[PDB]
CSV table of C-alpha atoms in Angstrom, one decimal:
chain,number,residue,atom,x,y,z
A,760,UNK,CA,96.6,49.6,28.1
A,761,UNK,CA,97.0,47.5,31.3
A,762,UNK,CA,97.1,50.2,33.7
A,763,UNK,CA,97.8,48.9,37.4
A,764,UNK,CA,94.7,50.3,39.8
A,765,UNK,CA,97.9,50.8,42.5
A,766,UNK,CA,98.7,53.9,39.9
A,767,UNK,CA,99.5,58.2,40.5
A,768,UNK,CA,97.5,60.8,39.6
A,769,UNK,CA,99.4,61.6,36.4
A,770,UNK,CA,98.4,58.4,34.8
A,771,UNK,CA,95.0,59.5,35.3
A,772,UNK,CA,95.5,62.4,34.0
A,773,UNK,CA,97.4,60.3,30.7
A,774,UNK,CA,94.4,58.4,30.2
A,775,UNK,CA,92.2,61.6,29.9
A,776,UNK,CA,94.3,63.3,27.7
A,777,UNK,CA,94.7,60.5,25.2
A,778,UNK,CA,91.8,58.3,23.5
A,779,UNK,CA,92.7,55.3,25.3
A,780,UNK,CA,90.7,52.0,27.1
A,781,UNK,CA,91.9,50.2,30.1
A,782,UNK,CA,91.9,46.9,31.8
A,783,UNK,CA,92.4,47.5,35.7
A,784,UNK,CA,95.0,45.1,37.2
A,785,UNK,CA,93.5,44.3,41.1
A,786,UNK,CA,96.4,44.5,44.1
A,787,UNK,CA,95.5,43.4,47.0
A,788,UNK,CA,95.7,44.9,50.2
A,789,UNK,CA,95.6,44.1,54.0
A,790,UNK,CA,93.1,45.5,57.1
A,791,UNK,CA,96.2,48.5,57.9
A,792,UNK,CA,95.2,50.1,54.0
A,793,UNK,CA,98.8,48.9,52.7
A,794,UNK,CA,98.5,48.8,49.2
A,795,UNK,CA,99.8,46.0,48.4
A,796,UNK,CA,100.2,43.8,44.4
A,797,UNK,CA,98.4,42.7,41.8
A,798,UNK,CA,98.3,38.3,42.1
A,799,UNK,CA,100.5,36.5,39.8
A,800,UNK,CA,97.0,35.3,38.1
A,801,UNK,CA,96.7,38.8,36.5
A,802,UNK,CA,99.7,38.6,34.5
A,803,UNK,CA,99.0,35.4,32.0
A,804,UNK,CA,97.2,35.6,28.9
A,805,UNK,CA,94.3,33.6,30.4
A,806,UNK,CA,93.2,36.6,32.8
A,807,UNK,CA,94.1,39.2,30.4
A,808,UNK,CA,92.4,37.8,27.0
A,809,UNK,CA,88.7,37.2,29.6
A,810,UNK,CA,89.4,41.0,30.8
A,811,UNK,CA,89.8,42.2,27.1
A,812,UNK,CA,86.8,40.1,26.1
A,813,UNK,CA,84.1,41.6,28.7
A,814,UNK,CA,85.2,44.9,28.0
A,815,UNK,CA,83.9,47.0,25.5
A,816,UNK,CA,85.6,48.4,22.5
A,817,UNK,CA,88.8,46.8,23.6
A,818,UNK,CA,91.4,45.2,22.0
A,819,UNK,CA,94.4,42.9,22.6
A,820,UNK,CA,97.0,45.7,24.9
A,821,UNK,CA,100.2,47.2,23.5
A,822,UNK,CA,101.1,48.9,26.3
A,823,UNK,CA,101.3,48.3,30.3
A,824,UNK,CA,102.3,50.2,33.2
A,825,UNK,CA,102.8,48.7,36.8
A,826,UNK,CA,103.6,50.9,39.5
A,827,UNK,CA,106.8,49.0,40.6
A,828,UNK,CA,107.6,49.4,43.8
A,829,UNK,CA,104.2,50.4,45.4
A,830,UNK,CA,104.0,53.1,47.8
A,831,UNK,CA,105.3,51.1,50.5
A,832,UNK,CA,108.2,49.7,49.1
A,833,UNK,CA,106.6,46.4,47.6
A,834,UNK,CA,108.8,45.1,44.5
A,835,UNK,CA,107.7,42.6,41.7
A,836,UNK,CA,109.4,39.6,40.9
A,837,UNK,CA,109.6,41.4,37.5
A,838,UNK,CA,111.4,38.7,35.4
A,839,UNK,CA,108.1,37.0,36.1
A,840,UNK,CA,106.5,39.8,34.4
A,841,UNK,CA,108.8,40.4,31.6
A,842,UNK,CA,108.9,36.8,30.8
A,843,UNK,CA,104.9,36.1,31.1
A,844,UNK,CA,103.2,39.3,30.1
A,845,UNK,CA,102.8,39.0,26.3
A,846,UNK,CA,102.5,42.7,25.6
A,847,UNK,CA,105.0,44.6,23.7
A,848,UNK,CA,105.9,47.3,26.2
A,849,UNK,CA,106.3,47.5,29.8
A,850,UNK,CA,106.4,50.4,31.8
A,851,UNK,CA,107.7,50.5,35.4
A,852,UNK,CA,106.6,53.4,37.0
A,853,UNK,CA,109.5,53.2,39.2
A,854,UNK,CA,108.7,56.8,41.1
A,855,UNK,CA,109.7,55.3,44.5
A,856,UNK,CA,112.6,53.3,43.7
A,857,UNK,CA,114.9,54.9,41.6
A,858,UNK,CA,118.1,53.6,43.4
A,859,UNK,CA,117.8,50.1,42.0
A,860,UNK,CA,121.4,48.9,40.1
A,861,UNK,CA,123.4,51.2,43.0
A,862,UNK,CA,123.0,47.4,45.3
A,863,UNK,CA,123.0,43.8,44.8
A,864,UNK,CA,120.1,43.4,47.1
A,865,UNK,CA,117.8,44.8,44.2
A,866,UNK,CA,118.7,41.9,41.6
A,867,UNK,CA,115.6,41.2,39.7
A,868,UNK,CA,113.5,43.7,41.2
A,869,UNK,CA,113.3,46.5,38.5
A,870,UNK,CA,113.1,47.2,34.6
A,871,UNK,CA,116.6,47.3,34.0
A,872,UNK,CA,117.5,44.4,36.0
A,873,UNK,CA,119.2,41.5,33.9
A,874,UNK,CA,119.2,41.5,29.9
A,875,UNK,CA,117.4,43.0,26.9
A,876,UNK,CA,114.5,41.1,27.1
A,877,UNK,CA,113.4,39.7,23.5
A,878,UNK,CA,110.3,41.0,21.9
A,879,UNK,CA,109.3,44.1,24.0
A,880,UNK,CA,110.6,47.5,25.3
A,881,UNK,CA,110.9,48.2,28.7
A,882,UNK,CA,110.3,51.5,30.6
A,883,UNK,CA,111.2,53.0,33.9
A,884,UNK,CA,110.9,56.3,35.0
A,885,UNK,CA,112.9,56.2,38.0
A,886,UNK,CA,112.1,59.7,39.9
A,887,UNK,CA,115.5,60.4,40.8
A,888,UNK,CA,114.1,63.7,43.6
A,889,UNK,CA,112.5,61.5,45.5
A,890,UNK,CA,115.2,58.7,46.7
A,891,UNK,CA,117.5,59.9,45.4
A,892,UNK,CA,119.9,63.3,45.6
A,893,UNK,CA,118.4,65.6,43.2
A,894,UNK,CA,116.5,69.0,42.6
A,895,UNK,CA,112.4,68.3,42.3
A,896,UNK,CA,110.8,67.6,39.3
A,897,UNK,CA,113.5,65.8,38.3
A,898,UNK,CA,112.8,62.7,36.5
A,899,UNK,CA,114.5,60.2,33.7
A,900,UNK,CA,113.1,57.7,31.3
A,901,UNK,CA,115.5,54.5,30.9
A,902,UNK,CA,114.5,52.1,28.1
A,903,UNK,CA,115.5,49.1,27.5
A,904,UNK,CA,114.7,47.7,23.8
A,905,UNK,CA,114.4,49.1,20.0
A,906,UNK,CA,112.4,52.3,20.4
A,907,UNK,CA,111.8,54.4,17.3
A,908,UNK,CA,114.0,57.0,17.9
A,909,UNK,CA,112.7,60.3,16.0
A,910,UNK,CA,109.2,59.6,17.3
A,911,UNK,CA,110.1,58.8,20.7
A,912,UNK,CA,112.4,61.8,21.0
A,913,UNK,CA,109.4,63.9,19.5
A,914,UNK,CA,106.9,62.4,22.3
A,915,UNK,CA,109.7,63.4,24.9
A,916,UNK,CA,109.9,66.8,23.3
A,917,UNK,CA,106.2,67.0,23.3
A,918,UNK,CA,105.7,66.9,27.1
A,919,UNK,CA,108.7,68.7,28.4
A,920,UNK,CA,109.3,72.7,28.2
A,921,UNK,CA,111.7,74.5,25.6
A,922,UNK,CA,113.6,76.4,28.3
A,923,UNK,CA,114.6,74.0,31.6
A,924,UNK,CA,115.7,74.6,34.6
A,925,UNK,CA,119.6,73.7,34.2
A,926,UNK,CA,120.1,73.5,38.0
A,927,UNK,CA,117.9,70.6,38.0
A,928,UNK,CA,119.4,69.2,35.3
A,929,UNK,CA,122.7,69.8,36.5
A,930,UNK,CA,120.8,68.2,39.6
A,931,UNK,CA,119.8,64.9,38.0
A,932,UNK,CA,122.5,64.0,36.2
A,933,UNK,CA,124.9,64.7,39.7
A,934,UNK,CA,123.0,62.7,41.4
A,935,UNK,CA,124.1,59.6,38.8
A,936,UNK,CA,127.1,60.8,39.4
A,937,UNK,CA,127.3,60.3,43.3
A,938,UNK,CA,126.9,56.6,42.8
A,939,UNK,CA,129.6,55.8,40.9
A,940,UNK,CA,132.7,54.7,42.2
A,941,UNK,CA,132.9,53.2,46.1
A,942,UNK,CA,131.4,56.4,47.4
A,943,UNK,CA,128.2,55.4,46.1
A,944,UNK,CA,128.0,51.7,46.9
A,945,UNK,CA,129.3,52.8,50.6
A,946,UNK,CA,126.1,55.4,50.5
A,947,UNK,CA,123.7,52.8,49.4
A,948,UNK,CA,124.7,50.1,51.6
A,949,UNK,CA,125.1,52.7,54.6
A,950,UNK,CA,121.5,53.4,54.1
A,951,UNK,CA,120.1,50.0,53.6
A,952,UNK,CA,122.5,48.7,57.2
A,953,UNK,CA,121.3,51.9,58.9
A,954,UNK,CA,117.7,50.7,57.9
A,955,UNK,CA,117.6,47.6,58.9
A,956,UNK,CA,119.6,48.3,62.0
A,957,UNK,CA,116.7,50.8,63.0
A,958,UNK,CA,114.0,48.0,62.4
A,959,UNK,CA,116.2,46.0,64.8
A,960,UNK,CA,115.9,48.2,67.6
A,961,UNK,CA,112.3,49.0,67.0
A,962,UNK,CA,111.1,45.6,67.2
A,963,UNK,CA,113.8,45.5,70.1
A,964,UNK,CA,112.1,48.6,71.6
A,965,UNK,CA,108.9,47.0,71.4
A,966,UNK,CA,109.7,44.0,73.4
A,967,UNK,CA,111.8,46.4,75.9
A,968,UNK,CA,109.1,48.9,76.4
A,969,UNK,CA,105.9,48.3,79.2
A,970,UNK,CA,102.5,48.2,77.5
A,971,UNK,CA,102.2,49.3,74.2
A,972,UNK,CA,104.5,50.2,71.4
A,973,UNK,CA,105.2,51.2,67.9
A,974,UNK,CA,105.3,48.2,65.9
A,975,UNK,CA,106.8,48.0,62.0
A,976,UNK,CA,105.4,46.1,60.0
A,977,UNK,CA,108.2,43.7,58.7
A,978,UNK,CA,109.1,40.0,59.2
A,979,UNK,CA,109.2,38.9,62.3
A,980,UNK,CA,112.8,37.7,62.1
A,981,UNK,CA,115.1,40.3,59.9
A,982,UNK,CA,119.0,40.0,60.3
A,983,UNK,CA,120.3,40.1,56.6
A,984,UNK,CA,120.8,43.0,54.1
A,985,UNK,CA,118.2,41.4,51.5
A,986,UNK,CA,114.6,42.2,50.2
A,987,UNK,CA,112.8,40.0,52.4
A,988,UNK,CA,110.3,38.0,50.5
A,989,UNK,CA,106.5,38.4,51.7
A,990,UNK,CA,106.1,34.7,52.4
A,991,UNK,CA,102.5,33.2,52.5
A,992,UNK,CA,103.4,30.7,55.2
A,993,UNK,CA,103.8,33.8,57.3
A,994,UNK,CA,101.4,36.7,58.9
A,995,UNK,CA,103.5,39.5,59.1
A,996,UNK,CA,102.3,41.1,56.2
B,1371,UNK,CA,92.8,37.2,129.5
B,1372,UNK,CA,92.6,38.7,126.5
B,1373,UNK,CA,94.4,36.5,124.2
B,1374,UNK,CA,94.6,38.2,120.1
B,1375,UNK,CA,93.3,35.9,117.7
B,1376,UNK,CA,96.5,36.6,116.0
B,1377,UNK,CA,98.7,34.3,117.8
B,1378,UNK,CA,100.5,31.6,118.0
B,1379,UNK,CA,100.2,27.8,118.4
B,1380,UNK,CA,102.3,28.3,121.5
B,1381,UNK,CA,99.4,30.6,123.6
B,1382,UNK,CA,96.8,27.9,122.0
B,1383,UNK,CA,99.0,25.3,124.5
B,1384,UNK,CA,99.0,27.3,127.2
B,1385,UNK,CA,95.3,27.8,127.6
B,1386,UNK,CA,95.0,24.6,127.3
B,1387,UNK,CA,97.4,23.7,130.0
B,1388,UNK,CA,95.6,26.8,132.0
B,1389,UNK,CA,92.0,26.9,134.0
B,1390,UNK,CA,91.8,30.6,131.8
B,1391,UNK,CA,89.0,32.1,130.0
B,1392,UNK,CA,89.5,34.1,126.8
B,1393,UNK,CA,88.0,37.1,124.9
B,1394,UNK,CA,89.5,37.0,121.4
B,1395,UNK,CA,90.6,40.0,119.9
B,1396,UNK,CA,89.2,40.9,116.2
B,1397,UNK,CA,92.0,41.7,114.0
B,1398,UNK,CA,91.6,42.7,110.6
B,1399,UNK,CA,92.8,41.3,107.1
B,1400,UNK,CA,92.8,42.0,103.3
B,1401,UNK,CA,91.3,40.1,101.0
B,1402,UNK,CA,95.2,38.7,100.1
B,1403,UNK,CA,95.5,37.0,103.5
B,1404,UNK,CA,97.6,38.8,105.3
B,1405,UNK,CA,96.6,39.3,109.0
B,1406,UNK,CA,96.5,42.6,109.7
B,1407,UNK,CA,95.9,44.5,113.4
B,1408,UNK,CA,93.0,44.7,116.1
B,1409,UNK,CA,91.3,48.3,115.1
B,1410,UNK,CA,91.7,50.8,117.8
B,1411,UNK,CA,88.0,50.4,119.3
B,1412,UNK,CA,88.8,46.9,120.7
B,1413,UNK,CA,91.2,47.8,123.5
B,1414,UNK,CA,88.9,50.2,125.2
B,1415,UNK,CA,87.1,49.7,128.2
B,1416,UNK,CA,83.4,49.7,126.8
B,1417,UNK,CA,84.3,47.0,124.0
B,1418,UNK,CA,86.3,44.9,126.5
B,1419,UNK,CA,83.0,44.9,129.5
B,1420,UNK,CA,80.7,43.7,126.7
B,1421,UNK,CA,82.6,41.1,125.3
B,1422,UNK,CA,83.4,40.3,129.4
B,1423,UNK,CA,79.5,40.3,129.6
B,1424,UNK,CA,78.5,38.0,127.0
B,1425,UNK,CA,81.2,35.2,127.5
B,1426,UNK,CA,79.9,32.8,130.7
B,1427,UNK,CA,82.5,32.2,133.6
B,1428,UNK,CA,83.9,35.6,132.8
B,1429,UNK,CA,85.6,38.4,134.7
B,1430,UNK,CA,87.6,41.3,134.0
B,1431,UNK,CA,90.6,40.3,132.4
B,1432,UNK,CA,94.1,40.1,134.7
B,1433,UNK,CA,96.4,39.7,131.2
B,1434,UNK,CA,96.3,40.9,127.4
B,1435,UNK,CA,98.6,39.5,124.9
B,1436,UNK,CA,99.4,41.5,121.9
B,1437,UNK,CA,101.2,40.0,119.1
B,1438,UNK,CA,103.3,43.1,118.2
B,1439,UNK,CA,103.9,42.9,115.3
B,1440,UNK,CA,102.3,40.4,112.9
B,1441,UNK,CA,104.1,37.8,111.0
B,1442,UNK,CA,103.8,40.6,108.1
B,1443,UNK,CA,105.3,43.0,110.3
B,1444,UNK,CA,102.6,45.8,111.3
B,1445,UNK,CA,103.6,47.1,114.4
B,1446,UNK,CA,101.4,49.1,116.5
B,1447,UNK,CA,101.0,52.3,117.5
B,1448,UNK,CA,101.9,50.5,121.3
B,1449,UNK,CA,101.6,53.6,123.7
B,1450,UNK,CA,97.9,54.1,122.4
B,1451,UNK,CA,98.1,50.4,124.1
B,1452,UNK,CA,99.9,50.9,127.1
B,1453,UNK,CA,98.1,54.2,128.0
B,1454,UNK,CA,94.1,52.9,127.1
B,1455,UNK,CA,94.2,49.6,127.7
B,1456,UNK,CA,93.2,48.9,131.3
B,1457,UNK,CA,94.5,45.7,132.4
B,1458,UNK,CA,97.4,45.1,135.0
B,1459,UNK,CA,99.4,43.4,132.6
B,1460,UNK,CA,99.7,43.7,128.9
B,1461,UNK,CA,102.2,40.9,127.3
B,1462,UNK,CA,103.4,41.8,123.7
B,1463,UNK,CA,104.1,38.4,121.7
B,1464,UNK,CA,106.9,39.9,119.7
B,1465,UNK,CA,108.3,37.2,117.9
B,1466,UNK,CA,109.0,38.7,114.7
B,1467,UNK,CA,110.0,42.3,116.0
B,1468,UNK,CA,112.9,41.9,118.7
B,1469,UNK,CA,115.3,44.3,117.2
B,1470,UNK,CA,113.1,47.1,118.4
B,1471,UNK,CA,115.8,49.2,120.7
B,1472,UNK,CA,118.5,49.3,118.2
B,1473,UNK,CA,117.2,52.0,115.7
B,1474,UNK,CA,114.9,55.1,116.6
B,1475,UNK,CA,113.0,54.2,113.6
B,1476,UNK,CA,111.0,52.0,115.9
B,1477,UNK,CA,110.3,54.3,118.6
B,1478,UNK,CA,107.0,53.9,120.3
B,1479,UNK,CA,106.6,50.3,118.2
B,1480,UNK,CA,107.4,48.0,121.3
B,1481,UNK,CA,106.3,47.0,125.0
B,1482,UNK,CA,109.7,48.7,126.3
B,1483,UNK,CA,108.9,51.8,124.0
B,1484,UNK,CA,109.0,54.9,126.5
B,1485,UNK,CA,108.9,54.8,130.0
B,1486,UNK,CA,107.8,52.6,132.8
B,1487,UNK,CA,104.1,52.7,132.6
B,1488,UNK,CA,102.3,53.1,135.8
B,1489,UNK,CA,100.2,50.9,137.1
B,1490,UNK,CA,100.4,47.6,134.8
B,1491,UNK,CA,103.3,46.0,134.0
B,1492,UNK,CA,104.9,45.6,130.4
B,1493,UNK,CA,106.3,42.1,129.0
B,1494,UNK,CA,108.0,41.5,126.0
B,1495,UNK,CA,109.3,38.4,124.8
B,1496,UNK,CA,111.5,38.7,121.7
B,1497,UNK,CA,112.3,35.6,119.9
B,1498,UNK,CA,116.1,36.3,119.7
B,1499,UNK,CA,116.4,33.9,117.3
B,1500,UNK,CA,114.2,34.9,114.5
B,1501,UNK,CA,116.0,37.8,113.0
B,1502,UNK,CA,118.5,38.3,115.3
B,1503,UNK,CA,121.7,36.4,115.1
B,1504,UNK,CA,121.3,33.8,117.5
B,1505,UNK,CA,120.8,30.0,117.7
B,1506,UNK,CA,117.6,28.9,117.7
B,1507,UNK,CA,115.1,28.1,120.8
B,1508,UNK,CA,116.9,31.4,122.2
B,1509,UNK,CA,114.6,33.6,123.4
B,1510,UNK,CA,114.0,36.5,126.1
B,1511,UNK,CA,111.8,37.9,128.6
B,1512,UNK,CA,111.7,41.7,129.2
B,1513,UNK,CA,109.1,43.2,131.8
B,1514,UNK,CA,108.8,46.8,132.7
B,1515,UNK,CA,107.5,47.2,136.0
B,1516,UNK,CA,107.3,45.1,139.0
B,1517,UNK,CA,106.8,41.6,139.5
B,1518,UNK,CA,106.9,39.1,142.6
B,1519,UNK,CA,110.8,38.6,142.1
B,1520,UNK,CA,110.4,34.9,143.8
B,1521,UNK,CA,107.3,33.9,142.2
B,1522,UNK,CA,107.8,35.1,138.5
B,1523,UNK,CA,111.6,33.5,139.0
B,1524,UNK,CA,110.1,30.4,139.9
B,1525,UNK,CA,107.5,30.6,137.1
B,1526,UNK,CA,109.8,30.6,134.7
B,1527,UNK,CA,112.1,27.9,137.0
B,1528,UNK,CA,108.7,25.8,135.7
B,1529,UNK,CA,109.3,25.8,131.9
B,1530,UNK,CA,112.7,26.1,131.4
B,1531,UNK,CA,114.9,22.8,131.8
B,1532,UNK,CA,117.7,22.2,134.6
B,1533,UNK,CA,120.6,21.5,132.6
B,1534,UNK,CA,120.6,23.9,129.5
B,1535,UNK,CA,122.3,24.3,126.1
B,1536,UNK,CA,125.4,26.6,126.8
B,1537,UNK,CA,125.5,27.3,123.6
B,1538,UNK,CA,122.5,28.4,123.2
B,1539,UNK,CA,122.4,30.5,126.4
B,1540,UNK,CA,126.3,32.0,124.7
B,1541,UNK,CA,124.3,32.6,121.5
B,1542,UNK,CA,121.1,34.3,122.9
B,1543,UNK,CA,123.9,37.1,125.0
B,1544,UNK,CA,125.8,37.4,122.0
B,1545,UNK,CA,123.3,38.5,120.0
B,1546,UNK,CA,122.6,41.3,122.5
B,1547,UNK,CA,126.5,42.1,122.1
B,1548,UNK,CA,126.6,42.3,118.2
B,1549,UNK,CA,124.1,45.5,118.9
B,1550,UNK,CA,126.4,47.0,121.7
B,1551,UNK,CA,128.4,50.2,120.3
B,1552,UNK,CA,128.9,51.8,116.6
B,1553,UNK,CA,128.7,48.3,114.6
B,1554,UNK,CA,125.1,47.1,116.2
B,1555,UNK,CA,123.4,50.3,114.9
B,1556,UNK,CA,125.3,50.0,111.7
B,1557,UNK,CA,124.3,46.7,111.1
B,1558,UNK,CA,120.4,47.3,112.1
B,1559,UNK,CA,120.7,50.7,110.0
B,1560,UNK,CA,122.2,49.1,106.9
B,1561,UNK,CA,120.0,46.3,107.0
B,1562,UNK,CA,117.1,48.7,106.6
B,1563,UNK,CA,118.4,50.8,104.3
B,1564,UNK,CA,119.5,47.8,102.5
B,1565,UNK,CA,115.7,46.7,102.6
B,1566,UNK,CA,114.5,49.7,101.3
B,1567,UNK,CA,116.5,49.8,98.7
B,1568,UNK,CA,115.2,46.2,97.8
B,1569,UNK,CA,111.8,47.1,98.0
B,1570,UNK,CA,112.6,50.4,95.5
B,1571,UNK,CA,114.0,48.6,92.6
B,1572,UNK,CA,111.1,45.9,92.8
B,1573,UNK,CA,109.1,48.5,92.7
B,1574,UNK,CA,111.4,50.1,89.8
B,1575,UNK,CA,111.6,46.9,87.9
B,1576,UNK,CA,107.7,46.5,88.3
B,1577,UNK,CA,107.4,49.6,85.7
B,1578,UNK,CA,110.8,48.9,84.0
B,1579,UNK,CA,109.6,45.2,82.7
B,1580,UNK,CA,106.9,44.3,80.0
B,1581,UNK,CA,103.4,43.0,80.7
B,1582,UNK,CA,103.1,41.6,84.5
B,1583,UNK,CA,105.6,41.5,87.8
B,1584,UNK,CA,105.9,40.8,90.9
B,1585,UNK,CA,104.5,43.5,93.3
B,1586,UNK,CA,105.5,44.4,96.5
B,1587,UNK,CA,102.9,45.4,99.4
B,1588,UNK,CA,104.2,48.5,100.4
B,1589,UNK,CA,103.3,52.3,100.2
B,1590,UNK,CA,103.3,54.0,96.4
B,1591,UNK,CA,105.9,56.6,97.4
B,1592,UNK,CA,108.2,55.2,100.0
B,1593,UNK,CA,112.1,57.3,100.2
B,1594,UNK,CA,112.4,57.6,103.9
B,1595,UNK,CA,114.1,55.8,106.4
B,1596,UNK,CA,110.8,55.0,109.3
B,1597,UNK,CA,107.8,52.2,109.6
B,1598,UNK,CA,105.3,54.1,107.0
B,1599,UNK,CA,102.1,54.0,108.7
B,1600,UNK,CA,99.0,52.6,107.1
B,1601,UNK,CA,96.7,55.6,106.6
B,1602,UNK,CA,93.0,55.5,105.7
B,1603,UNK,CA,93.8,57.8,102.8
B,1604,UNK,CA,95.4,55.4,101.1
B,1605,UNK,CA,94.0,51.7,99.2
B,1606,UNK,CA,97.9,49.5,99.2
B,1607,UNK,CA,97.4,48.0,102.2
């Protein structure tokens, strides 16, 4: 597998339970202790073939999991990824981001953004508690692809208990069901102006304020409802 | 005489036009510049005889002039002046100060503070002027005691010119008669209440505005309405 180093506990915890061998993908990460991404060098087959090679009892990778977005809200330019990594399953271990297709903003910055990609099945296990409006330990697993469906249905029934809790089912799927319609684009967007209009007065605070203050750690010039890029001709960052 | 150090270019001329002999006060200053006050050990009689001994051609002095106050404004504490220092006539240069009667903020801060001292005679000579509202080379003469009435007349018969500026003469009374009645005090009392006030917000905006400002040399807690003495407790001044 090509398990991003940026990764939870439970994919630990995978790897011990099952007789598998990784390759580590390397993020980077700034002086704060931001954990930043993996390069786009780490995703070709250049990179990935030397990393198989020095590694021992290692094969070519069927599988790979990237933790998309990181723990402080970094998204991929994944159709870089799903165009350029030549393995035939990519999971997005979307934990943090689970309110992706709900906004425009997020176009091209998850799993199931834009087509069936040819060749390969792609994951994301959106945890829909933690963004979202749901019950904990409430998760889902979106796929997007050709999976075999008896043995994939078996893996899921492998994993997950025979008697659930139906208030967090009932939990997870009404918490789909608050985003559709206008009510649901109106709570998205609400949160994303209401976010951006608080970085505006902190940096505004900031440069009010005698002394110190709180700074956020942001591009220095933010007025549009969009993912700002992390530029390299800027600082910030 | 004994001339301060803090004066004027105007007593510089007259000693030169005068056969006089001076012992030069020692006023104190802060390392901004501003000239501060003669301390208090300077107009007593065992300072003043040494000085008076160590100057050649010297005897004990028949005049003092006082510039009360500064050009920063520090008035002094001017019936420690009138009652210790022991000449026959103590002349108060005050220039900068000659709205002194017209609020009891500045009681005891003048040469016609209190009574009429016994013994020496008191002259003030306001520079009407300055920060009253007349035209200028209007000034004043005020004694407190008495004087050879033909002699001091013709004195001043000396300096002044025979034909002068009616205007200026109308001004310099009319300035006395905007402080006749109700609207003299209210001007002199808004005017320092107006001052204060000033001098609160720069102090506000000092701590309201980020990284440096302009500072205002004045006591850390000023609310009140009087001259706020410089005490030895205190480092502002």
């Amino acid at each position: 597998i090509l398990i991003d180093r940026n990764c939870h506990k439970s994919l630990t915890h995978l790897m011990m339970m099952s007789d598998v061998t990784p390759i580590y993908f390397r993020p980077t990460r700034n002086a704060y202790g931001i954990l930043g991404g993996i390069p786009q060098s780490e995703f070709q087959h250049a990179t990935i073939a030397k990393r198989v090679k020095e590694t021992p009892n290692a094969t070519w990778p069927v599988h790979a999991v990237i933790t998309n977005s990181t723990y402080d809200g970094l998204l991929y330019n994944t159709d870089f990824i799903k165009k350029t990594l030549d393995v035939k399953s990519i999971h997005f271990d979307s934990a943090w981001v689970p309110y992706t297709n709900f906004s425009p903003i997020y176009e091209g910055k998850c799993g199931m953004s834009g087509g069936r990609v040819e060749g390969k099945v792609i994951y994301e296990t959106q945890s829909t508690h933690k963004l979202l409006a749901a019950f904990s330990q409430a998760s889902m697993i979106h796929v997007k692809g050709d999976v075999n469906e008896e043995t994939f249905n078996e893996a899921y029934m492998m994993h997950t208990t025979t008697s659930p809790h139906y208030g967090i089912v009932a939990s997870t799927e009404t918490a789909a069901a608050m985003m559709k319609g206008n009510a649901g684009k109106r709570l998205i967007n609400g949160s994303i102006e209401r976010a951006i209009k608080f970085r505006k007065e902190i940096k505004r605070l900031r440069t009010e304020s005698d002394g110190w203050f709180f700074d956020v750690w942001q591009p220095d010039h933010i007025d549009t409802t969009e993912c700002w890029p992390l530029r390299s001709d800027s600082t910030w960052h």
